[PDB]
Structure formats: structure tokens, C-alpha cells
């Protein structure tokens, strides 16, 4: 409109005010007059009007024609550029080869490369770079640091980015500022900590100066690689060459480690900070909070948040939310609940994020207590509870067992006229399963089936759930029999329940279901097994079942050499739970507990061998392990059974120089193998050194 | 048999020789013999031979008649619980109410209720207790400690164990070694810290002497508590009173810290250790390994790892496993090769859980080189692959794209004879989704139905996906049908394979979906559809959308609030975008990234607000954010726009003055609004101030 004259104004405004889908039509209706214009102007024009898809329409259509050429092709590729359109540019540029690089100008790329690599599509910004190659195109600066940037974002790509590099400093491209902040973040992106150093030196002995970016990226490689001393190096380095540390730079310093994991950094960071007089921020503050969070410190994360409201910070919503989630994390239900007080009366008010972290905990005692509060507490301040607050409620009510709160809400929901769904049945269901209630379950899933939802394969493992609480064989045997006419939810559920209620067939039978769809059986599962076949006394199969853990690349736990020493134990091949215990005692990744020095030495003593069960006791004990007072009867109990008096004595005296004392049933015990093997003179000596163990014995001979 | 007269030694012989399920007759049999025995005695020796289910059945039977009394039930009571039996003493007892407790000896039951302990069977341990308790039987020591342990493990029982102690000290019961113990591992369980500090103190000025016992149990309270410097005071009083730390002693400690999360402790543990000429364990350096390995510490690991090398320890497969796993958490491809290399030449050979590790990782560049080295690390040396080695070999290949290499493995698999099954296929339909090739993964999928498999929710979320890359609305649409006459996999697959197409229909369709069955939208899902209401140009709905996100409970991030200020942007509402930025400026718990700022300054030149854009750099690089080039070409081409030529100027000298150096294009960009202008003369001057430019102006004018 200022640079062409005016007929082809009248031209141009007349093709703009034409409707896109049959523009072709009325540019054909101008052929004649068309090739005469020059056609680079028109599309110059279209895109300062706006028209960028009328100027691609025109070039497209110019291309069927002579009226194409490399003026034309630049002013639309850079037009598109600019407007941000890189998938028309794509589909352009496929469509077309370019033409002799003497008549390219790289600089028309720049902005196109510029948005391929903003957008993800780092592939196509380098076809494009690459076709520019082609034709012996000789980037610029700015094309290079665009092409520095895909490779960076790209990844584990520095090797090309060195040769890139290599590149521009044979043509003689001097790198600026923006170069060395790419090719740094570049380096800090995957963890080349050695080799942004290396960059950096280079850099600094080509006596190229450094600004504020390029420390700043340098302490971002440094921050992201956990890197203290280094980093601490390159502030000083800032301080000395004009830039000069900031409230700025530490903040993302400490926030960087922070998030990058390491948080003892971080809030060194923050000391240094408060030294120096510098402020830190919330945002700061509460990735350091994060951090000590993730890595399950608290108590720690909680002091900092003492340190920030203690400087005066009044905390909001989302930092409240932050650590309550965080505390959500472990169950603090206690200091959960002293903070939503401290909230309240802080100043601000809870959202439903807050209602929605409080409620998403499971566990332990205490939690339907503590729901309850949280009950209180909502409706102790304004909240209409929406339909999907319900369903938050009986779920977390559903998650303790409190069947009779759950039923409760349930009701409040219907009462206040609400279409409870689906994730609402199956928290019904899943409060059922602890009193296996399967006759109310049954019920729900017919009022969940008419009502017109359909049964979640998540209803159906609940359902499963409840019938092995209630020792129902039935609902499980008749469930299976659908699956079979199907998930893995399902599956191990099945496995599961069979197992709650040692029905071996549809454990072989739920097993082979999971393996014939070459699945992952998953270590609980194998243990089952294992289980049921030690149970069953089929021991060659669990011997094939282990052999069929280590076969594929699991490894077995503790729960797993535990059910095998136990089984050799039922044996009365407790040499064998021996030798595995001996196995797992250097095993370098394991170690035995309790439960397999118990198995041994209460094997042991069963089969008679009560010497080695002492020598295995001896090593328990060696290892710094505790044994109970019934272990300890088990063993002395053991030598009484045999007539080994002495022993028997020895060990209880071991109990009695120690603090422990021994049961008054192991006295007993004693005195009662010595009656039996008429042996009264005996154990009458044995009182006198150790009164109703003497009656006793008076009782037992006369 | 060596208590029992001669003729009660037939009866209990012959009745031990009889099959048990139809023992009741043979003893109806002689009832009138029977109910003269001392039927006591007779249960005693069925005890003694083995036959406590014989037991237990002639007690069930004595009851029927007059033949049962007390010392008959404390007899077999003690024999099953000695047995370990507690689902039949459980049974038996549910069967009686216990006679008066004249005639209850507490003894009797400890057994039965340390079963019951060990079982996790606690609330009828506790019912058995409290059965005994209405009988006014008074514990004994051991009744206590059993049953402290029992409120020990059950958790939350801090209260009720106070009282049980009380009630020891009014009852005159003094606490012995178990005692203490246990009520020290209740509170270690808990993090009962200050608690078991109390006790502790307590049991002391009371004058009683710890043993090795409970100081190693106060050592797993502050162990599992992080609690370094009480744990230190601990070890001290060890030292002064008697027992005296340990090689044992120190690595517990360590490892306990470790277990729990504690790293940093550990290692200063193994520091001190290191110190005082104790040994450390193989498992405790492995311990502290995984500490540092799960929180992410790998460097310090593999550090640690070495200092376990150089002392001479040589590793095995399990701890090479470990530290293989740790870096396959990461994606640390070179360095796992490097620990293969040092495996074999070390001295010990991979099994298949070293192999199933290598090759369960995913990632990034580089992937499928690796796993090529693995191959041929893997024939390099035996390895028979199993039929299962295969699909972690196809999973593998099929992760990155190397779909070549993908069907050269399953080839490989078909030609040494193998049934592949599900997971192979699911394997294959899993690299095709890269290359978008629909037509070869529907080719699967008909193998995989005749060959009489069944594919998994798993197969047809991978099927989705080879539409969406492939452009295919066809087949998506298809599926989607076949869906709706149903998993959330597939569902969440449908909303962002429709996505990806662009096809708002289906997104609606499949989020009304998820949202039907009263289910869990997720943040992917709801920045999809706010998403796409964007890009459609309805905005109230997802601004609907982005309240339905805020209205339940979830919150959004930076890619919601990037979709929203890009959409305000894209309305010339690029006021409303800059409220957002504001809003998380001042979040607390969020902060803007380089998208949001980009999104502000392009939106405000876009609505010819350039002044405004500005200040929003102005702000960008104060919170010391790095704007790139074409970002600085986009406001000096802004203020270019409307012939505010010294403001773009005034861009530029900042530029320079920062060793940024502007694009080419950016000069160019000024001259050209200068001679669109008309002011041929101030662009000269321009570029006087600041050649190919000057003869573009002079090619302009003349």
C-alpha cells in the first residue's frame, strides 16, 4: 500500500478480500495480469496486511504457472517465519527444492529454523539446515546459534556441537554472547560438567569477555550437576569481572540444586544467603522445602518453614498445600491437622486442593480419627461439599474400614440429591472387603448395574477381595469362570485370593492365565506360589517355582528364602534351611532377620539336632541379633526332650547373666523331663540351685 | 508311655492308630471307658507322640459328654500352642467360654499368644488377652512382654502401652530384659523418639541395669529417626557401662541410618568406623549405596563403590546387579557398559537378572547403540537367551524406534523355534508407533487374534497410537466405536490421540467418557482439552476447563497457564496474559518460565502495545531470565511497525552494549520501516550511527 503503485494495489486488495478455499480461480482469472506483476511485492504486501495464508496461495499458485521464482519463495518463507507458522513452511518446502544457493539468503531462514526449534521439531530445523547446506549456503552467526540450540535441546549430541563450533571458527564466525550461553546450557542439560569447563577456558584464552548469561548459564551446568565448589568459583569469578552476585543469583542457584535433587547444597546456599545479607525468596523457600520433602526429610523441611515464617514471610494457600501434601506423603495426621488450625487462623482459607491433599492419605490407626476432624473442619467454615468432595470422603472413609462412616456420607450424598458414579461404588466396595461382606458388595454391584454404570476392572478385584475375606469359594470360583469366556488387575487379584483361601487349582489355574499372555508374573505373585506348594507338601513344584524366579531375571526377597527354609524345615530338612541361611548370611545384598534364625533354630530343634540349633542360636546372637524368651524355651525344651539336663541349665543360666529370666513354663519344662525319666532326685537339685515346681515334682512321685 | 498305667497306654496307642475323621466313633466306642480315663493325661500323651489333632479331637469329643474340665483344656491350649496351631486354638476357644479363673494358669496361654504375635494375627491375640483379663486372671511377666510386643507392632499404641506398664509397677511385676526391649522397638517402629528417650531415662533412676539388648534397641529408635547426635550419646554409654560398640554395633547403626533414608548419617557412620579400625560389612556398603542411589545420589555411590574395591572387598553379581540397577535408573548407558566390562574381567558372569537390568531402561539418544553392545556383550559369552530374553530384547529395541533391529530379534526368536506371545507382539506394536505405521501393527494384531491370543488394553493403547502418528482419524474413529458399545488406558489414549489429530469430537466424546464414570480427568487430560478450545477458538470453554481443573482439587502447572496466556495472547487480550504472569510472579510456589515471558512480549507486539512489551522484557531479564535474538528483533521490529525508530535504536545499543550482537535481519528490519516511511535520509543516518543496507536504501529511493 506505500511501496506499490496503484493499480497493483487495487490487485492486491482485491485477492486479500477473496475467500481462501477458491482463491486459485480468481488468480487464474488474472493470469494475463499476473504474470506481468511483480509477484514478490504482492506477497510482500499480503504479509504486512495480515494475509500470510493468501500470500502462501499466491506463491503456490504462481508455482503451476512460470510466475514463480526465488524472491517470491524467500519473502513467503520469511513471511511464515515470522508469523510463527512452521508446519505451512514444512509442507512448503516439501513440496519445493530450492534453488541455486547464489540466489538464497540464509538470513530468511533464521526465524523459521527459529520456531521449528521452539515447537520440539528439532528434526525438520535440521533437514531445513541441512537443505540449506545442499546448496553451499554459508550460515551466519544467528544460524549457528539456532542450530547450537536444536543440538542442545536435542541431546547427548556434543560431539557436533564441538565440530559446529569447529565450523564457525574456520569460516572465521566469531561467537557472541548468545553462542556461549547456548552452547553452556547446552553442556548443562545433559551433565557435560568437564566440558562446559573446557568450553568456558577456551572461551576466556581467546580473550572473548564473558557476560552476565554466560555465568549465569555456568552456574546453572554446576547447579544441575550438584557441583558446590565449582560453582562457588564461578560466583567469585562474577564478583571479580563486573557481574556481581545477586539476590538474583543466589535464589536460582539454591532453587537449581533444590530441584536438581540436592538440597544440602541448596540450603547451604540459603546460609551463605543469610550471611551475605541477602534476601531469598517463597518460590525458593519452597523448592528447598520440595527437595527435603521428595528425599522423605520432613522435620527438616518443616524447620525451614519455621526460618520462613520466623523472617516475617506470611505463607499462602499453595505453600500450606505444599506442605501438607508433604506430610500427606508419610500419614502425619497429627501436624497435618495442627497446620490446617495454623492456616484458619493464619489468614487464609483452605481450597479444594487443600480438602483434596488432606483426604488422598492412607494407612495406619488413626485415620478415620482423623478424617473425621478433617469432616469437622469442612464444614466448621463455609465449603459446600461438591459431588466429587463425596466421593473424596467415602473413599477416605472406605480406606480405614469405617464402613458405618462411609455408608454415612453415602447417605449425605443421596440426601442432598447427587448421581453418586461409579468411583463412589467402588469405594463402598472397598470399605466391604474388611469384614468380608460380600452380600452387600453383590447388592451394590446389581444397583451400580442398573442404574446403568458398568463394573470397572477395579469393582471386580474388590469383589474378589471380598469373597476371600469371607472364606466365600464360591463368588471367586464363579467370578473366574466369567474371566475365562480378563486384565492383570484381575489376574493377580485372582492368584491373591485362591491364595487367601488356599485354593490351590485356581491358583495353577489364575498362574497359567498370567503366563499365557507372556505377561510379568510379579514377586508377590511367585511367592504365592511357592507358598501354597511347600503347604500342599508338592515340594519338587516350589522347588520349580524358585527355579522359575531366578530363571527370568527377578530376584527373590527375604519372603522368599523365608518360605523355603521354613518349607525345608517342615522337611525335617533342616540342613538345608541351614545352608540357605548360610547363603543369604553372604549373600552381600542380604541379610537374614529374625524370622530365618527362628526357622532354623525351631527346625532344628524338631529334628532332633538341638546341638546345631544352639550353634545357630550362638551365631544369632553373634550377628547381634535378639531372640525372644520363647525361642529360648524352645531350645532348652529341646535338650530337656533328649534328657541333656545340663545344657538345658546352661542355657538358662546364659538367660539369667544377661537381664532376661526365663519364663516360669521353662522351669517347668525342665522339671517335667526329669519327671518323666524318673529322674525326681534330680530335679529337685535342679531347684536348689536355679515352690510350685517342687509340689509338683513331691506330687509327680508320691 | 512312660506316665500312663499300662491299659490307658492301649487306649491312647489305639486311638492314636485310628484315622481321624471318624475318630468320634471309635471313642463313642468306648465312652464308658473313657469318661473313667484321666482324660488329661491321655491328651498329654497324644501331645508328647505327636497327635495334637488327635488331641484336639478327643477333647472336642470329651466336651460333648461330661468328660471335658479345665486342666483338659489348658492341656491341649498348651500342646497347640507349642505346636504353633493358632487357627485351631482360635477355633477351639471360640467354641468355649473358659472356666472360672480359679482354674486358669496364665502359663498356659503365652505360647498360643506369641503365636498369634508372630502371625500378625493381633486383634485375636488381644481377644485372647482380654478373655483371660474377664477371668481376673493376673499376667506374668511374660503375659506382659508378649503383649506389649503385640501393641509394639500393631502401631499407634503409645497410650495403652504407658497404662499396661502401670499396671506391671502396681502389680509389682519389675521389668526384665525383654521388657525393655520390646517397649524401646515400639517406639523405634513409631519414631517415638522422645518416648523411648523417657522410658529409657525412667528404667534407669528406677535402678535397673540395661543390657547390650536395649541399648541396641535404643539404637534403632535414633537409627530409624535420623537422630545422629543422641545416637552417639548412646553408643558413649554403651562404652562407659559395660558393653562397648562393636564392628557389629557400627554397622547396624550405619545400615539402620541408611535404610531409612539417611545417607549422609550413614557415611559419617562408616567415616568413624573407617577411624577407629572397625570393618565394614559388604551389605552396609551396599546399604548405604542404595541410600545414595535412591534419593539419586549415583556419583557418591559408584565413589563409595570404589572405596569398597580398594579395601580389598571383592564384589559379587548381586552387588554389580545393585549398582547396574542404579545406573539403569538414571539412563547412565556408558558407564553400565564400563561395569559389565569390569564384571567379566572382575571374575564373575552375568546371570539374567543382570541382563533383564541392563536392558530395563528406556531413554534418549544412544539407546539403541547400547543395547546392540549389550547383544553382542551377551553372545560374547554363553547366555543361552530364553524365550523370555527375547521379548526383553524386542521391548528393548521396540523403546527407541530400531524397529529394523526389533524385527531382527523377533526373527532371531521365530527361527530358533519359540512360541512368542502377547508381549512380543505389544513389543512390535510398540516401534511402530514412531514411523505412524498403522498398516503393519493392524497386521499384527491379526496374527496375534488367530494364532488364538488376545490382545491386552495395552495392545490397543499402542494401535491408537500408530493412527495418531499416522494421521489415521479412520482407524482411531473405529477403535473409539468399538469402545463405546473401555478401559481408562485406552480412554486417556483416545483424548490425546485425538489430540494429536486435532479432532475436537472425539476428545469431547472420550473426556465425557472418563468424566462418566465418576473417575480422575488428569492434568494431561484437562491441558489437552483447554488446549484445544484454544486452537478452535471457543474460549469460554476452556476457561470452563480450566475452572473445572481448579473446582475439584487438582492445580495446574506451567503448561496450563503457558495454554492460557497463549490463548489470551492470541485474542489481543494480551492484558490478560500479563495477569497471569503476574499471578505466578507472586505465586510462591511457581514460577514463570521463558514460554510465559515470550508469550507476553509477542502478544503485546502482536496488539501493537510495544511499549508495554518492553517493560515485560525489562522485567524478564530483572528476575534474570535470558531472552534469545529473535525475541529482541521481535520488539525492535514492534516499535519499527509504528516508526518509533528511537526506541528500536535504543534496543539495539543494549544489545551491543551486552555482547549480544542483533541479527542481520534486525538492521535490515529497521531500514526497512524507515523506507517504507519515506525517511530515506534518517535511514542513512541510521546507519551512519550503527553496506548491503545502504544499498537497499539506495535501490528504494532511486
Same mark, same amino acid.
Given at each position: 500500500?506505500?511501496?506499490?503503485?496503484?493499480?497493483?494495489?487495487?490487485?492486491?486488495?482485491?485477492?486479500?478480500?477473496?475467500?481462501?478455499?477458491?482463491?486459485?480461480?480468481?488468480?487464474?482469472?488474472?493470469?494475463?495480469?499476473?504474470?506481468?506483476?511483480?509477484?514478490?511485492?504482492?506477497?510482500?504486501?499480503?504479509?504486512?496486511?495480515?494475509?500470510?495464508?493468501?500470500?502462501?496461495?499466491?506463491?503456490?499458485?504462481?508455482?503451476?504457472?512460470?510466475?514463480?521464482?526465488?524472491?517470491?519463495?524467500?519473502?513467503?518463507?520469511?513471511?511464515?517465519?515470522?508469523?510463527?507458522?512452521?508446519?505451512?513452511?514444512?509442507?512448503?518446502?516439501?513440496?519445493?527444492?530450492?534453488?541455486?544457493?547464489?540466489?538464497?539468503?540464509?538470513?530468511?531462514?533464521?526465524?523459521?529454523?527459529?520456531?521449528?526449534?521452539?515447537?520440539?521439531?528439532?528434526?525438520?530445523?535440521?533437514?531445513?539446515?541441512?537443505?540449506?547446506?545442499?546448496?553451499?549456503?554459508?550460515?551466519?552467526?544467528?544460524?549457528?546459534?539456532?542450530?547450537?540450540?536444536?543440538?542442545?535441546?536435542?541431546?547427548?549430541?556434543?560431539?557436533?556441537?564441538?565440530?559446529?563450533?569447529?565450523?564457525?571458527?574456520?569460516?572465521?564466525?566469531?561467537?557472541?554472547?548468545?553462542?556461549?550461553?547456548?552452547?553452556?546450557?547446552?553442556?548443562?542439560?545433559?551433565?557435560? @560438567?568437564? *566440558? /562446559?569447563? +573446557?568450553?568456558?577456558?577456551?572461551? =576466556?584464552?581467546? &580473550?572473548?569477555?564473558?557476560? $552476565?548469561? %554466560? #555465568? !549465569?548459564?555456568?552456574?546453572?551446568?554446576?547447579?544441575?550437576?550438584?557441583?558446590?565448589?565449582?560453582?562457588?568459583?564461578?560466583?567469585?569469578?562474577?564478583?571479580?569481572?563486573?557481574?556481581?552476585?545477586?539476590?538474583?543469583?543466589?535464589?536460582?542457584?539454591?532453587?537449581?540444586?533444590?530441584?536438581?535433587?540436592?538440597?544440602?547444597?541448596?540450603?547451604?546456599?540459603?546460609?551463605?544467603?543469610?550471611?551475605?545479607?541477602?534476601?531469598?525468596?517463597?518460590?525458593?523457600?519452597?523448592?528447598?522445602?520440595?527437595?527435603?520433602?521428595?528425599?522423605?526429610? @520432613?522435620? *527438616? /523441611?518443616? +524447620?525451614?518453614?519455621?526460618?520462613? =515464617?520466623?523472617? &516475617?514471610?506470611?505463607?499462602? $494457600?499453595? %505453600? #500450606? !498445600?505444599?506442605?501438607?501434601?508433604?506430610?500427606?506423603?508419610?500419614?502425619?495426621?497429627?501436624?497435618?491437622?495442627?497446620?490446617?488450625?495454623?492456616?484458619?487462623?493464619?489468614?487464609?482459607?483452605?481450597?479444594?486442593?487443600?480438602?483434596?491433599?488432606?483426604?488422598?492419605?492412607?494407612?495406619?490407626?488413626?485415620?478415620?480419627?482423623?478424617?473425621?476432624?478433617?469432616?469437622?473442619?469442612?464444614?466448621?467454615?463455609?465449603?459446600?461439599?461438591?459431588?466429587?468432595?463425596?466421593?473424596?470422603?467415602?473413599?477416605?472413609?472406605?480406606?480405614?474400614?469405617?464402613?458405618?462412616? /462411609?455408608?454415612?456420607?453415602?447417605?449425605?450424598?443421596?440426601?442432598? &440429591?447427587?448421581?453418586?458414579?461409579?468411583? %463412589? #461404588? !467402588?469405594?463402598?466396595?472397598?470399605?466391604?472387603?474388611?469384614?468380608?461382606?460380600?452380600?452387600?458388595?453383590?447388592?451394590?454391584?446389581?444397583?451400580?448395574?442398573?442404574?446403568?454404570?458398568?463394573?470397572?476392572?477395579?469393582?471386580?478385584?474388590?469383589?474378589?477381595?471380598?469373597?476371600?475375606?469371607?472364606?466365600?469359594?464360591?463368588?471367586?470360583?464363579?467370578?473366574?469362570?466369567?474371566?475365562?469366556?480378563?486384565?492383570?488387575?484381575?489376574?493377580?487379584?485372582?492368584?491373591?485370593?485362591?491364595?487367601?483361601?488356599?485354593?490351590?487349582?485356581?491358583?495353577?489355574?489364575?498362574?497359567?492365565?498370567?503366563?499365557?499372555?507372556?505377561?510379568?508374573?510379579?514377586?508377590?505373585?511367585?511367592?504365592?506360589?511357592?507358598?501354597?506348594?511347600?503347604?500342599?507338601?508338592?515340594?519338587?513344584?516350589?522347588?520349580?517355582?524358585?527355579?522359575?524366579?531366578?530363571?527370568?531375571?527377578?530376584?527373590?526377597?527375604?519372603?522368599?528364602?523365608?518360605?523355603?527354609?521354613?518349607?525345608?524345615?517342615?522337611?525335617?530338612?533342616?540342613?538345608?534351611?541351614?545352608?540357605?541361611?548360610?547363603?543369604?548370611?553372604?549373600?552381600?545384598?542380604?541379610?537374614?532377620?529374625?524370622?530365618?534364625?527362628?526357622?532354623?533354630?525351631?527346625?532344628?530343634?524338631?529334628?532332633?539336632?538341638?546341638?546345631?540349633?544352639?550353634?545357630?542360636?550362638?551365631?544369632?546372637?553373634?550377628?547381634?541379633?535378639?531372640?525372644?524368651?520363647?525361642?529360648?524355651?524352645?531350645?532348652?525344651?529341646?535338650?530337656?526332650?533328649?534328657?541333656?539336663?545340663?545344657?538345658?541349665?546352661?542355657?538358662?543360666?546364659?538367660?539369667?547373666?544377661?537381664?532376661?529370666?526365663?519364663?516360669?513354663?521353662?522351669?517347668?519344662?525342665?522339671?517335667?523331663?526329669?519327671?518323666?525319666?524318673?529322674?525326681?532326685?534330680?530335679?529337685?537339685?535342679?531347684?536348689?540351685?536355679?515352690?510350685?515346681?517342687?509340689?509338683?515334682?513331691?506330687?509327680?512321685?508320691?
Amino acid at each position: 500500500h506505500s511501496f506499490l503503485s496503484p493499480d497493483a494495489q487495487v490487485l492486491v486488495l482485491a485477492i486479500s478480500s477473496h475467500p481462501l478455499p477458491t482463491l486459485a480461480a480468481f488468480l487464474a482469472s488474472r493470469r494475463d495480469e499476473l504474470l506481468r506483476a511483480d509477484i514478490t511485492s504482492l506477497l510482500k504486501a499480503l504479509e504486512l496486511s495480515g494475509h500470510w495464508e493468501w500470500a502462501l496461495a499466491l506463491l503456490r499458485w504462481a508455482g503451476k504457472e512460470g510466475a514463480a521464482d526465488a524472491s517470491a519463495l524467500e519473502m513467503v518463507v520469511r513471511a511464515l517465519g515470522r508469523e510463527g507458522q512452521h508446519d505451512a513452511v514444512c509442507a512448503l518446502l516439501d513440496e519445493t527444492p530450492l534453488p541455486p544457493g547464489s540466489r538464497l539468503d540464509v538470513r530468511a531462514y533464521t526465524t523459521v529454523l527459529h520456531a521449528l526449534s521452539r515447537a520440539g521439531r528439532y528434526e525438520r530445523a535440521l533437514e531445513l539446515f541441512a537443505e540449506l547446506r545442499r546448496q553451499g549456503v554459508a550460515p551466519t552467526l544467528v544460524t549457528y546459534n539456532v542450530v547450537l540450540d536444536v543440538y542442545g535441546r536435542m541431546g547427548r549430541s556434543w560431539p557436533r556441537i564441538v565440530a559446529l563450533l569447529d565450523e564457525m571458527r574456520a569460516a572465521g564466525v566469531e561467537p557472541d554472547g548468545f553462542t556461549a550461553s547456548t552452547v553452556i546450557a547446552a553442556c548443562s542439560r545433559d551433565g557435560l @560438567v568437564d *566440558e /562446559a569447563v +573446557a568450553f568456558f577456558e577456551d572461551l =576466556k584464552a581467546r &580473550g572473548h569477555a564473558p557476560s $552476565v548469561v %554466560t #555465568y !549465569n548459564a555456568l552456574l546453572q551446568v554446576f547447579g544441575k550437576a550438584g557441583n558446590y565448589t565449582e560453582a562457588l568459583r564461578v560466583l567469585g569469578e562474577m564478583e571479580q569481572n563486573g557481574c556481581q552476585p545477586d539476590a538474583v543469583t543466589y535464589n536460582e542457584l539454591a532453587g537449581t540444586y533444590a530441584r536438581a535433587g540436592f538440597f544440602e547444597e541448596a540450603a547451604r546456599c540459603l546460609d551463605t544467603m543469610a550471611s551475605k545479607g541477602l534476601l531469598p525468596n517463597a518460590f525458593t523457600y519452597n523448592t528447598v522445602m520440595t527437595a527435603y520433602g521428595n528425599v522423605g526429610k @520432613v522435620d *527438616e /523441611a518443616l +524447620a525451614l518453614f519455621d526460618q520462613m =515464617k520466623k523472617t &516475617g514471610f506470611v505463607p499462602n $494457600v499453595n %505453600t #500450606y !498445600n505444599l506442605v501438607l501434601g508433604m506430610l500427606g506423603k508419610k500419614s502425619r495426621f497429627t501436624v497435618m491437622l495442627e497446620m490446617l488450625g495454623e492456616m484458619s487462623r493464619s489468614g487464609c482459607t483452605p481450597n479444594r486442593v487443600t480438602w483434596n491433599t488432606m483426604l488422598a492419605v492412607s494407612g495406619k490407626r488413626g485415620m478415620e480419627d482423623y478424617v473425621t476432624r478433617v469432616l469437622e473442619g469442612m464444614r466448621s467454615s463455609g465449603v459446600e461439599l461438591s459431588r466429587d468432595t463425596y466421593n473424596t470422603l467415602i473413599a477416605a472413609y472406605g480406606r480405614c474400614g469405617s464402613r458405618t462412616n /462411609a455408608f454415612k456420607m453415602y447417605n449425605e450424598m443421596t440426601s442432598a &440429591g447427587f448421581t453418586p458414579c461409579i468411583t %463412589t #461404588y !467402588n469405594a463402598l466396595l472397598n470399605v466391604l472387603s474388611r469384614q468380608g461382606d460380600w452380600s452387600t458388595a453383590q447388592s451394590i454391584v446389581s444397583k451400580m448395574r442398573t442404574k446403568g454404570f458398568k463394573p470397572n476392572e477395579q469393582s471386580y478385584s474388590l469383589l474378589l477381595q471380598c469373597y476371600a475375606k469371607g472364606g466365600n469359594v464360591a463368588g471367586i470360583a464363579a467370578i473366574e469362570n466369567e474371566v475365562y469366556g480378563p486384565s492383570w488387575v484381575i489376574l493377580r487379584t485372582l492368584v491373591i485370593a485362591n491364595f487367601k483361601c488356599r485354593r490351590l487349582d485356581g491358583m495353577e489355574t489364575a498362574f497359567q492365565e498370567v503366563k499365557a499372555r507372556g505377561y510379568n508374573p510379579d514377586l508377590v505373585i511367585f511367592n504365592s506360589m511357592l507358598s501354597i506348594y511347600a503347604k500342599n507338601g508338592m515340594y519338587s513344584k516350589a522347588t520349580e517355582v524358585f527355579d522359575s524366579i531366578k530363571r527370568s531375571g527377578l530376584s527373590p526377597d527375604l519372603i522368599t528364602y523365608n518360605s523355603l527354609m521354613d518349607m525345608y524345615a517342615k522337611c525335617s530338612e533342616s540342613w538345608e534351611a541351614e545352608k540357605i541361611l548360610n547363603q543369604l548370611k553372604c549373600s552381600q545384598t542380604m541379610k537374614p532377620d529374625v524370622v530365618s534364625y527362628n526357622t532354623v533354630i525351631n527346625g532344628f530343634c524338631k529334628q532332633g539336632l538341638v546341638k546345631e540349633a544352639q550353634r545357630v542360636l550362638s551365631e544369632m546372637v553373634a550377628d547381634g541379633m535378639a531372640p525372644c524368651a520363647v525361642t529360648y524355651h524352645t531350645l532348652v525344651g529341646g535338650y530337656s526332650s533328649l534328657e541333656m539336663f545340663s545344657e538345658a541349665r546352661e542355657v538358662i543360666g546364659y538367660m539369667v547373666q544377661h537381664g532376661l529370666k526365663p519364663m516360669e513354663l521353662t522351669y517347668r519344662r525342665v522339671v517335667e523331663s526329669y519327671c518323666r525319666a524318673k529322674r525326681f532326685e534330680e530335679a529337685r537339685g535342679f531347684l536348689s540351685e536355679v515352690k510350685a515346681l517342687e509340689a509338683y515334682i513331691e506330687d509327680a512321685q508320691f
